[PDB]
Design a protein around this nucleic acid. Sequence first.
RNA 1: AAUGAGUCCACUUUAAAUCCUUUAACGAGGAUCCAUUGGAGGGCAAGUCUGGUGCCAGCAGCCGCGGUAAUUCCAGCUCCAA
RNA 2: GGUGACCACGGGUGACGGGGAAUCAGGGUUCGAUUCCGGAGAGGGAGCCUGAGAAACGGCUACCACAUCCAAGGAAGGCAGCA
RNA 3: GUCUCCGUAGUGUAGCGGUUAUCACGUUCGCCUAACACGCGAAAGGUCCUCGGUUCGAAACCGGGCGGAAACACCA
Lengths: 185, 262, 131, 58, 441, 70
Amino acid sequence: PVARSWVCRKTYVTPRRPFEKSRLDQELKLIGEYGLRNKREVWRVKFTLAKIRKAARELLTLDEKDPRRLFEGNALLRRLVRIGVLDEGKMKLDYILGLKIEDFLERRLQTQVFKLGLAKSIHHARVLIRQRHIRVRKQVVNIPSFIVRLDSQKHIDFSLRSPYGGGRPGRVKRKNAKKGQGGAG
Amino acid sequence: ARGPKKHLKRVAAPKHWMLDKLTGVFAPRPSTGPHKLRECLPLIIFLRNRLKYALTGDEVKKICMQRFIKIDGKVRTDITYPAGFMDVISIDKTGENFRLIYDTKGRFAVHRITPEEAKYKLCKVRKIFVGTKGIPHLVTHDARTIRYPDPLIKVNDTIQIDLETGKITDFIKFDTGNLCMVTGGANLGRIGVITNRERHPGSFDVVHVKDANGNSFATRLSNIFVIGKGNKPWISLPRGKGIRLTIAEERDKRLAAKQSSG
Amino acid sequence: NDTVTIRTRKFMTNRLLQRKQMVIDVLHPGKATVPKTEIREKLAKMYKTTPDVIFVFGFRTHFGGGKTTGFGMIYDSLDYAKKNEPKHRLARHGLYEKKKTSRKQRKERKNRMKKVRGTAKANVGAGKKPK
Amino acid sequence: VHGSLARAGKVRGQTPKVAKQEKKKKKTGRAKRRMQYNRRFVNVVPTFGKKKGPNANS
Amino acid sequence: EKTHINIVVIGHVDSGKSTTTGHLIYKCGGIDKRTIEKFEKEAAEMGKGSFKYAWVLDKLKAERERGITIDISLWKFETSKYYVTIIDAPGHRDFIKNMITGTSQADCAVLIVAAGVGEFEAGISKNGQTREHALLAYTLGVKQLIVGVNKMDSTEPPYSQKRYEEIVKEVSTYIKKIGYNPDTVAFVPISGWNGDNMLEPSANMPWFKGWKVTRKDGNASGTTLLEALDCILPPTRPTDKPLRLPLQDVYKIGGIGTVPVGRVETGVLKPGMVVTFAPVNVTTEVKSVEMHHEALSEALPGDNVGFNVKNVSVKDVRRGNVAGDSKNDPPMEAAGFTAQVIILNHPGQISAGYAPVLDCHTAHIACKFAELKEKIDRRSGKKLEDGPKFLKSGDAAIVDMVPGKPMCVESFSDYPPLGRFAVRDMRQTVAVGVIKAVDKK
Amino acid sequence: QLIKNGKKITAFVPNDGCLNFIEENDEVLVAGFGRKGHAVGDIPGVRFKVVKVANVSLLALYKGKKERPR
RNA sequence: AAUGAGUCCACUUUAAAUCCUUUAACGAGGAUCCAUUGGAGGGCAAGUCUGGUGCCAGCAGCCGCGGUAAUUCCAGCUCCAA
RNA sequence: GGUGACCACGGGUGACGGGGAAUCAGGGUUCGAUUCCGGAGAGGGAGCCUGAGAAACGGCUACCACAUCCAAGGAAGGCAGCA
RNA sequence: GUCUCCGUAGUGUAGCGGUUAUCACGUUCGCCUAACACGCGAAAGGUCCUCGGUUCGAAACCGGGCGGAAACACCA
Ligand SMILES: [Mg+2]
Ligand SMILES: [Mg+2]
Ligand SMILES: [Mg+2]
Ligand SMILES: [Mg+2]
Ligand SMILES: [Mg+2]
Ligand SMILES: [Mg+2]
């Protein structure tokens, strides 16, 4: 029949029990400090950390020197140090369990442009990313959840077409200028 | 069904064909020929996804119908002709020759050979019987049969068939200590030397193979192609010499190659 | 026009279809996707040929502008290009005409012609009445 | 039937219709989350009350 | 290309209303000789052989066995100059609502009164239905019409002058009273059961030397019905005006679904846009359109077509509903409307709260007079007095009413065919008028 | 009385004035009343509640978001 | 100051269209270009606010609320969860 | 003689089987009409020609159930294919 | 579309061309109780489905239309 794929998976897990003060306040603190839109995308990063920790624990259950354990452990550690959430000298499966969601939230492009001073606040950072003002290497990114690697950490910069790098001021600037010259010849 | 199937779904195609999932719903469905469809390489995918000489089935059809594709010294216009194991693909207009040999991962690789080496071809005999008038007969691993062979040649040995004549020029006996190649199962595409053959009457004989690195394995007797007299192969081996290396020493080779290229 | 460059990659020549094929990308910094004809003559200059044998298609523009990439096709001669090439790219260049009835009407005629046996005048007169 | 269905919609019927008070729009999405984080996390109050709830009817 | 004109045949019960038009449809080539002989044999058993031509229009078995027309029926043929369709009428006191449906969806009309003694006199009287037919003709917008007298073979002597002359003078003075011009309308003698004077001048009667019709478009002379009907005025087409389409009936045809049928008033309907039905307020894409089992690309005004719509059932949309394009102004349910009316006859006085039945286009809805605004002169629309308290016959007035049942109307100043309406009670047309202002719900 | 299998049931009408939106011979849609064929609350032997009437939801009529199909 | 959601030219895509990605020109100050669905006694986060009703209407998965001062119904305001 | 308390035989299935899916400490519990593989069927049965391959139904024959046309003498049917 | 029947307070119906009323009731109010339960007496409740016609006058005599309950056909 059809040549589709229909391979898809959910990226978040809802909490087992709702309406609990501690989890609600922690999640709201994370959202407010990191400028997230809703609770779904803090549950998403929690799910990502949970899957990584499950893989780490499963590998730790395997016997040492097992080639499958070694191969998957080095692959997982390499990915963890590429995304920058783990220290380069911390190449052990035990340290993977000690990582936190705050480590993953810090590597987001939205937090990164705020840390680099390109934005005045985290919400300014998000709205600045969404409007195609931020570029990585050469590609422009409008996705706040863009996880930035260590090699791509240095290459975050304003978009050339944006009215903060190259020229071409926005529509309101041009409208104000033409109104000013029309009122004042 | 009420008869033979003449379709082949894309996902049910053999894995070593390396077909994807999004281009279509169907697979080439190779025609009947010298080789089973499970371990054959129809010329459409060979000329479209290995060589990229064509972009679609229609372009490879135009390529074939201009009479440039030569298999075993004969021009084959069948777009879905089952090429199969170690049949020489000759393209005279661009002047290169291909020997179809499994790689280290058990897939047909793009192996280029010289024209003087392309003139001959190894064949594994499958059965030897005597026909009418007491005339001996010999059947290869292909569908090719030849009369009047050497009486020394026995079952599942290897013979040297030269093209444009179809005759036997030399043979290699299936003996312990001869270089072989596995043509089925998990050990597909692995080059090694015959070390032991334990035979089970009423079942499948099992033969043991050790490669140059010293890694020993075993496989069924039906999945072995003797390729060399002792240790020197009679064919040009592909990249890696058919030595299956594990992922641990594959990853660091990739890293070293990237560091050299970077 | 001031800042447009053609860079080729994955270039290869084949004699099976008597052509040289490649995939190319054009860098338009602040302009729209470059029209295919412009690629045609700029590549013809790039390979010292005429802007009639040049065949391009499949131009997808990357997100945020800048680079757009398509697959290039150049033949040795026009007769070969008419011989081995899909008819729709010929029609895009005007070298092939598609003046023909609908598939529905063609099926209607084919099914109506099945009702008349043998008789040439009536089997060709089958579609004259039900227009 | 015992005949008691004639009182259907009674209290809703007698409830005096009072119009909703027109009001400023509420921020939605990320801005709402920011505002409610600001209200209940970044603030210092010098007045007692044993941490009275956000809907205190004082 | 070739124009289309709707024709409606009105007359009396058993006046040959269907027999002579069966003759006509057979002579012009609507049916064959074999079918008419089949009708003859089927009428031979139960003795109603005189209506064998009438059963062509009388599609119902009940219509055949009862010998009368219960509801309208449709037929088609090609004339020597253009294309037309024909609608019969029930021609009975009980089925006035059915025939005003057909006459409302008309372009022209023909009226039939039997020339025999005892029927023409009963035909045109107070209880006589010819007055009702001719009145509703002008009420519902029959701008031009012809008249043909039937069954002068039973007259004494058959095919005679003075009988024809007295009946044409009677109907001529009646139509001069009603507003129609005797000069414009043709006067044709036709012998139905014998089948005379439809294609050729029947020489059994030589005293008739043809009629002359003089009109604003031009002049014409005639000796036969075909010569009369080929020179009718091609009615105007309000094509630019947005789509309006009342629904004569709804069918559930096997394999395609619901097919509402109605005569297109304004606009062009073609398969490929959504339509809206006003009394029920349902929105639905039109799928296909078809006149007389012939598929068409468009529905021009004045076309009595059946159009197929999608994903709906037969009970969603019913008779009397009006369709219109949602892309243009959509028709929608009306709370009430202001109407200027002409009171015709009523034994008592008319008061507020009087609830007769209003018959507009296809719809037949009883409307209750909310209150009376003012009385109006017969002519020129002149003011008489404000706030009336009663009404009598021979009067005009401005009155506001609300339909008891959901109904959609259009003011005459906007949609003329839907502006015309009639009022029926006690088996006469009590009031006639047009619509001026309509509120929208 | 259900359209299929002709069974007669009793269904609660769950709001303040939604009995007046119900007339005879209507086509109602009835769902379960909460706990899988078991009576709920102070209502003896009622296991169903009306969701829609005449192919329009009782919620829409109660909120007044749309009108009866007159 | 900055952007889209939309209008909308061209290119591109495509068998031909369409969509997406490019890209002209318009396009935001109640930026009215308007976020909803369910709740606020407990479970279970959220009101001992105000007006109606008075074991009536109704709510309530369960405990239970209502018999004239309802933290639970019908409404306004205000909060709560996604 | 053969099969049976190691459940024969019979009945029921809201049973096409599997690869798989949902839930997820571990162990398990439900669901797989559904795109891949195997099977069955073409309204219900039944019987055949041709062909290498059919008990074929976008082949035929017969009965049964529905159902089309008719000039009433006959003729023609199978959307659990795409719409 | 046609035909058949029915339609009075909220249900159950008396009803006369010259009076629509009662009844189990239903409701309300007094009637005792903190709340009841039982129990005593009055009131309201009708365009006679609606609109008209006949008549000096009709709910009822008739013509429609509406709602419901039956059946009949209705295939661009
Ligand atoms: Mg509340
Ligand atoms: Mg089953
Ligand atoms: Mg299955
Ligand atoms: Mg299958
Ligand atoms: Mg079968
Ligand atoms: Mg069969």
